[PDB]
């Protein structure tokens, strides 16, 4: 029998639910969504990391002008300064006076090391959402099935035939352009590789930062060196990557709606408690705890003996009952702000079974069900 229940995405908190099937009392169903991963397809746009500015020695042409030739360095910038150095002595040595001409060249590369202090710029196109759905059916055993939240791959697993109809909200860690550092993940726009931003993120761009043959813009401004030294001095705009890492006021990591650990796999939202998850659980008729077999539930009452106010499972209550035929009845609360710890209760002829519950109310009012029979539990803490 295929039975469709909806578990609120409570990560780590098992959701008690009842499997109703005609003229058969409920089946113990506890569903815990262990993990939801929104994983989108990532096309890597570029690496950015702590750059190192590299100053090569400048080309001085004695007795004539120096022309700049473009070089494939990432923020290669040159400027030609004429008449920099007199003939001989200080500066360049030359026969000619102010015919000395300097090309002052410099560039940025990625540092010696970058693989732990780098961000990755990704264009992101549409993904898949996986859900690790732990479905227990019949009695406590905590079976679990990876199942696509998408229609692509329903779990045809032996741990019930599971279809996960799409989660009501499945958090999107992506927009179109996302930068991931994974210590601070940002939905963050940038121009596609080959075009960067100067002194803002994309300060260094690559697609595998290795030093040289990367593309950068960082607003490198060579300065003219006063005579008596031959070298290339420069000013530059601040590092955009370093500024970007510190732009944590609450990254994508902290704005996640129902809380998700936005993570660098390349960009995915881990451990979301987002939405509520449609769960189609095939509970076979063979796993029923039905009234029409050994269960029969009559005369049900809930007494709460003590409780800790709105606690993890600090509620202690006892459900006293009568059975015409002893069985095992599933203890449950269809709430998502309250769950019963156990999902089974030994229904007996005149028994009492003390069950532990959780509620989100100071005075815990949760609807407790054994089998097909329902009671309300209240206060008395």
């Amino acid at each position: 029998y295929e039975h469709t229940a909806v578990m609120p995405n409570k990560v780590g908190i098992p959701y008690k639910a009842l499997v109703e099937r005609p003229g058969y009392a409920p089946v113990h169903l506890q569903i815990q969504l262990v993990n939801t991963r929104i994983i989108p397809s990532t096309n890597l746009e570029y690496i950015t990391c702590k750059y190192k500015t590299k100053v090569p020695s400048p080309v001085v042409k004695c007795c004539g002008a120096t022309q700049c030739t473009s070089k494939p360095h990432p923020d290669y910038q040159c400027q030609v300064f004429t008449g920099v150095y007199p003939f001989m002595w200080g500066g360049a040595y030359c026969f000619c006076d102010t015919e000395n001409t300097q090309m002052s060249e410099a560039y940025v590369e990625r540092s010696e090391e970058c693989s732990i202090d780098h961000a990755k710029a990704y264009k992101v196109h549409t993904g898949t959402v996986q859900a690790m759905v732990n479905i227990t059916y019949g009695s406590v055993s905590w079976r679990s099935a990876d199942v696509y939240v998408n229609g692509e791959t329903p779990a045809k697993i032996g741990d019930a035939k599971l279809i996960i109809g799409p989660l009501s909200s499945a958090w999107s860690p992506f927009d179109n352009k996302v930068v991931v550092y994974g210590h601070e993940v940002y939905n963050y726009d940038f121009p596609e590789y080959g075009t960067g931003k100067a002194g803002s993120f994309g300060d260094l761009q690559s697609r595998t930062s290795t030093s040289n043959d990367l593309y950068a813009n960082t607003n490198l401004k060579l300065q003219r060196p006063q005579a008596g030294i031959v070298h290339t001095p420069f000013t530059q705009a601040p590092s955009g990557f370093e500024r970007w890492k510190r732009d944590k006021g609450a990254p994508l990591n902290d704005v996640a709606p129902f809380g998700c650990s936005i993570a660098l796999e390349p960009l995915r939202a881990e451990n979301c408690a987002v939405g509520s998850i449609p769960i189609s659980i095939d509970i076979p008729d063979a796993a029923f705890t039905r009234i029409s077999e050994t269960p029969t539930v009559s005369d049900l009452e809930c007494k709460i003996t003590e409780c800790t106010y709105a606690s993890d499972f600090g509620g202690i209550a006892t459900v006293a009952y009568k059975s015409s035929k002893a069985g095992n009845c599933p203890i449950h609360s269809p709430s998502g702000v309250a769950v019963i710890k156990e999902n089974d209760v030994t229904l007996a002829e005149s028994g009492s079974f003390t069950f532990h519950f959780s509620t989100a109310n100071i005075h815990p009012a949760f609807k407790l069900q054994v089998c097909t029979s329902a009671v309300t539990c209240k206060g008395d803490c």
């Binding site: 409570k10 990560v11 780590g12 908190i13 190192k52 540092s111 010696e112 090391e113 970058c114 693989s115 732990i116 202090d117 550092y181 210590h183 601070e184 890492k245 944590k248 006021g249 609450a250 990254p251 990591n253 902290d254 704005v255 996640a256 709606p257 129902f258 809380g259 650990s261 451990n271 408690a273 800790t308 106010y309 709105a310 606690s311 993890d312 702000v337 959780s358 989100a360 100071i362």
Partner: protein, 238 residues
Amino acid sequence: YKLARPYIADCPNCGHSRCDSPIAIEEVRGDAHAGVIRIQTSAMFGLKTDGVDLAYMSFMNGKTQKSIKIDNLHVRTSAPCSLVSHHGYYILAQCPPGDTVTVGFHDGPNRHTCTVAHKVEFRPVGREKYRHPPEHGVELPCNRYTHKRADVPFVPVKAKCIATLAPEPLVEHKHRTLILHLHPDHPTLLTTRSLGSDANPTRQWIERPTTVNFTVTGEGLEYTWGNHPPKRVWAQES
């Protein structure tokens, strides 16, 4: 493997006005949050005339592969320092702060010693960077680099450095509401979001006993206390 030959290089200050040194540091990586240093020297360490050794270096100074013992050419801060690994053209050493490294020969009246002021770099590895190793707390992942060579530059790695810890967010449970009395002894970044239906998008830098109250829906919340990656509590009285 290493095979980039030893060389000499000008170092800003040696002797009095001496600057014609070998063994001179060109570049430094300080990716470590520990007091270890990755050094790029003109001179090649970890190679003598015999090829690859673990306690010999080579330099020019009128030579091209002439070697000495790593104790003859001794690293120092203002006291000796012993290197740990050689990766050719790069040295990696323990020198007390890892923020001042002086590689020098204090042999005879001509005293060439190069010093480069090295650095310790702290960068996110949790959701925040963290301070230098202390007595307090326990080791966590840090930015770092390899501390043994391949048989030329050492490669970045995440290794473990002692984090400054202090009391983590002392949670005080209340009716589906969590005030977090946090008591740093050191600059810690407090990041939150709820893991209930709500969210608590709050980065704040904290130091010393403070409170930061957050809402919850009875369905958990995350507090990251920077230097760690997310820590999560879920539907207690959360």
